[PDB]
Design a protein around this ligand. Structure first.
Ligand SMILES: [Zn+2]
Length: 28
């Protein structure tokens, strides 16, 4: 839950990381 799973961006907020990975996840 904590820290990034695919990119060296590791903080301490799992749910900042949820919507970080919801970055890992929509692009326009
Ligand atoms: Zn990341």
């Amino acid at each position: 839950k904590y820290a990034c799973p695919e990119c060296p961006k590791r903080f301490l907020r799992s749910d900042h990381l949820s919507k970080h990975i919801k970055t890992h996840x929509n692009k326009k």
